[PDB]
């Protein structure tokens, strides 16, 4: 369909793990959108390509855990797209992006 990004530049601590737990790093966000995230961070491997991860952070006292795919890593920067497989995942993304607009 068609999607507005609701790109919101914001700086918030996040933790990122790949799906098998072999990699775990910390960082801060640069921007968030309905599409994904840009994060200041250093990924310790070369990306084949879109690699499934979990992103964890806190906002307004709430823990938010969002599945995602890292799609690029360029030291100082990790780029992600959200993975949304249900309503709770859809709304965690909404809570994050609009929670930051608020």
From Swiss-Prot:
Domain PilZ: 1-76
Gene: acsAB
Induction or repression: Cellulose is produced at a linear rate with respect to cell growth when O(2) is present.
Function text: Bifunctional protein comprised of a catalytic subunit and a regulatory subunit. The catalytic subunit of cellulose synthase polymerizes uridine 5'-diphosphate glucose to cellulose in a processive way. The thick cellulosic mats generated by this enzyme probably provide a specialized protective environment to the bacterium. The regulatory subunit binds bis-(3'-5') cyclic diguanylic acid (c-di-GMP).
Record localization: Cell inner membrane
Organism: Komagataeibacter xylinus (Gluconacetobacter xylinus)
Residues of the full protein shown: 572 to 670 of 1550
Domain comment, as recorded: There are two conserved domains in the globular part of the catalytic subunit: the N-terminal domain (domain A) contains the conserved DXD motif and is possibly involved in catalysis and substrate binding. The C-terminal domain (domain B) contains the QXXRW motif and is present only in processive glycosyl transferases. It could be involved in the processivity function of the enzyme, possibly required for holding the growing glycan chain in the active site.
Name of this protein: Cellulose synthase 1
Family statement: In the N-terminal section; belongs to the glycosyltransferase 2 family.
